[PDB]
Design a protein around this ligand. Structure first.
Ligand SMILES: CC(=O)N[C@@H]1[C@@H](O[C@@H]2O[C@@H](C)[C@@H](O)[C@@H](O)[C@@H]2O)[C@H](O[C@@H]2O[C@H](CO)[C@H](O)[C@H](O[C@]3(C(=O)O)C[C@H](O)[C@@H](NC(C)=O)[C@H]([C@H](O)[C@H](O)CO)O3)[C@H]2O)[C@@H](CO)O[C@@H]1O
Ligand code: PIN
Ligand code: CL
Ligand code: CL
Length: 194
């Protein structure tokens, strides 16, 4: 029912997450190996690692109209509240979009399940981090991802034919946690677990 071969992935993708909307980001002078966006939604300062394309995108100073999708992590910088990527532009208008999910699953025994789902997007711009994190956590919850089976792929398919693939046998590559896409152009989501 739960295989220890996948324990790290199942623990990573069942971690709680936090969403910060219509917020402000402060980036200061580089002090270590990378640069951080500081966000202060409550009594804490959160350090959001500027990885991948976020490094060039954000100069030092103040950035308004910022959403962040947060998954707090251990780290080697001695930081209490740290997460990687998931910074996006705050909605410029109402967003309430759902995309169809089709899920196919094959265990080691040959049993082939077929689920469907609907995925609610409430952001005009959304990080792959958020999509990857929320879709995996769901698959674990409802389809036993990282229980009996722990590989395969998620494919996000777009109105224009483009796509974004998450391979299920490892974490999303950290650089990709900074990648962002138009939520309301997500057409459907194809999950294949094998
Ligand atoms: C070492 C490392 O972390 N390197 C990553 C790249 O990932 C490695 O190379 C891959 C080819 C694969 O072996 C993977 O296991 C390695 O970790 C990474 O390259 C992306 O990897 C993912 C799979 O993890 C996809 O294969 C992706 O291709 C696509 C996609 O399907 O998602 C193709 C697609 O056409 C394209 N979409 C559009 C609209 O242009 C997307 C899109 O560029 C990305 O999804 C954006 O995140 O890519 C491989 O590109 C690479 C991607 O940025 O980053 C590190 O270099
Ligand atoms: O489980 S998680 O690690 O994801 C949640 C961590 N978390 C988010 C909300 N706060 C501060 C609230 S406040 O006191 O500053 O208002 C601490 C508890
Ligand atoms: Cl961790
Ligand atoms: Cl797009």
């Amino acid at each position: 029912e739960i295989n220890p071969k996948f324990k790290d992935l199942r623990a990573y993708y069942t971690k709680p997450s936090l969403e910060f909307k219509n917020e402000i980001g402060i980036i200061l002078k580089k002090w270590t190996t990378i640069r951080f966006m500081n966000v202060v939604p409550d009594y804490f300062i959160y350090k959001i690692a500027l990885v991948g394309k976020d490094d060039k995108k954000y100069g030092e100073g103040v950035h308004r109209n910022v959403d962040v999708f947060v998954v707090l992590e251990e780290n080697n910088y001695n930081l209490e509240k740290y997460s990687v990527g998931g910074i996006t532009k705050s909605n410029s208008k109402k967003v309430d979009h759902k995309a169809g999910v089709r899920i196919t699953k094959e265990d080691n025994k040959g049993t082939i399940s077929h689920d469907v789902s609907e995925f609610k997007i409430t952001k005009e711009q959304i990080s792959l981090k958020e999509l990857d994190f929320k879709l995996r956590k769901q698959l674990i919850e409802k389809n036993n991802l990282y229980g009996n089976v722990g590989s395969g792929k998620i494919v996000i398919k777009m109105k224009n034919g483009g796509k974004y693939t998450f391979e299920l046998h490892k974490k999303l590559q950290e650089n990709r946690m900074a990648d962002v896409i138009d939520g309301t152009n997500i057409d459907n989501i194809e999950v294949n677990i094998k």
